Amino acid sequence: DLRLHLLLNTSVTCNDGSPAGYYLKESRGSRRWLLFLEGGWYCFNRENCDSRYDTMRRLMSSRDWPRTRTGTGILSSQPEENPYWWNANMVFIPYCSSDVWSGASSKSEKNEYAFMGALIIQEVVRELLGRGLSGAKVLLLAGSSAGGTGVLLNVDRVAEQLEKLGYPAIQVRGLADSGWFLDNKQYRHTDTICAPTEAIRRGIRYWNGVVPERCRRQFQEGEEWNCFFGYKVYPTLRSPVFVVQWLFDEAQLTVDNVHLTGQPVQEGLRLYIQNLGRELRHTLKDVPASFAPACLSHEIIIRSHWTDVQVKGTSLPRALHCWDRSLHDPLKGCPVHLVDSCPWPHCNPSCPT
Ligand SMILES: *[C@@H]1O[C@H](CO)[C@@H](O)[C@H](O)[C@H]1NC(C)=O
Numbered sequence: 001d002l003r004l005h006l007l008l009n010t011s012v013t014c015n016d017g018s019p020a021g022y023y024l025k026e027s028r029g030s031r032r033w034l035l036f037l038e039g040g041w042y043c044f045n046r047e048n049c050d051s052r053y054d055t056m057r058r059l060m061s062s063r064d065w066p067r068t069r070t071g072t073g074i075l076s077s078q079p080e081e082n083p084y085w086w087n088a089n090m091v092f093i094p095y096c097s098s099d100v101w102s103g104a105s106s107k108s109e110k111n112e113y114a115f116m117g118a119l120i121i122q123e124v125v126r127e128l129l130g131r132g133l134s135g136a137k138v139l140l141l142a143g144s145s146a147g148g149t150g151v152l153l154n155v156d157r158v159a160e161q162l163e164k165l166g167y168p169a170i171q172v173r174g175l176a177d178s179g180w181f182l183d184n185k186q187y188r189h190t191d192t193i194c195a196p197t198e199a200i201r202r203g204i205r206y207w208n209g210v211v212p213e214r215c216r217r218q219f220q221e222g223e224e225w226n227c228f229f230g231y232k233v234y235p236t237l238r239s240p241v242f243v244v245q246w247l248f249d250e251a252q253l254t255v256d257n258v259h260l261t262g263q264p265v266q267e268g269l270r271l272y273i274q275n276l277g278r279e280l281r282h283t284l285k286d287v288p289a290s291f292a293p294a295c296l297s298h299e300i301i302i303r304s305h306w307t308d309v310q311v312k313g314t315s316l317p318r319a320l321h322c323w324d325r326s327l328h329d330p331l332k333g334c335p336v337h338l339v340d341s342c343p344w345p346h347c348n349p350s351c352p353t
Pocket residue numbers: 009011012119
């Protein structure tokens with residue numbers, strides 16, 4: 001079990017002004033720290049944030065959080081479940097800012113909600129430095145879905161923060177799971193139910209959203225939404241980032257207005273889906289540390305059966321171990337770049353059921 005700690009700095013809040021926090025399981029033996037960013041979409045105006053507050057309140061408030069969470073997949077302390085980092089210090093940072101971890105805005109007389117995702121990550125790192133992180137060799141900032149995008153937006157700021165606090169020895173790395181989206185044409189055009197590009201454009205203004213400096217400098221004022229797209233922000237990052245991305249991500253297909261029912265798929269949708277997989281594969285061509293199976297799924301790294309999926313006979317835990325070896329100073333039978341070439345969901349027999 002990971003134990004809840006609410007942030008001692010109560011100016012750093014969830015959407016409703018309740019304190020943000022983190023779940024921690026310390027490993028006294030280990031100088032490895034895994035900080036996992038939870039996902040769960042976002043909200044980008046008063047009306048859709050109000051709806052989220054009614055039926056997804058745990059993603060907007062700490063008021064109802066449990067005292068403990070069970071570490072699963074990459075957050076498991078059991079080697080059987082987590083061959084990769086079972087002995088690491090484990091941190092789960094709940095997503096309660098609805099801002100893809102980009103926000104730097106307090107609740108005030110002008111703001112119904114606080115969007116403090118970027119500041120929550122900063123505050124968790126600062127408070128952990130007094131709990132053993134000061135002795136770390138490696139800090140892996142990991143995350144799934146909106147948390148995966150959060151890794152891309154925040155990994156270099158965590159590295160900068162530790163450099164400026166006088167910990168240049170701590171190696172900051174990123175693991176972005178199911179956070180690598182395409183600003184592609186929808187299969188069918190569609191209110192909130194608004195394509196990611198426009199929703200993110202509006203979100204940044206609403207959240208006072210912040211993006212990595214080099215990406216911000218490239219795209220400039222009014223175009224920072226570009227930095228929420230992996231293939232655009234990744235090349236601007238200095239920190240090593242491992243990209244885990246299903247070629248047919250369910251969240252990508254949802255925003256593209258693709259709904260597979262069981263009826264025969266006709267030529268138009270077949271070509272659309274094959275084109276999406278090919279586009280995803282293209283964006284990963286020059287990403288040296290990547291795991292991209294040809295599956296229709298969403299998230300993997302905190303799922304208990306994350307060990308089961310393979311690309312070219314290599315599991316994700318093995319790929320991550322090979323990545324660790326690669327960052328000592330290519331390795332025989334220890335690959336780090338694993339992208340499926342087969343063009344249809346579940347052409348990989350190891351895809352989740
Ligand atoms: C508390 O958090 C706020 C907002 O991130 C920050 O400006 C302030 O410096 C923090 N104070 C302390 C004591 O950490």
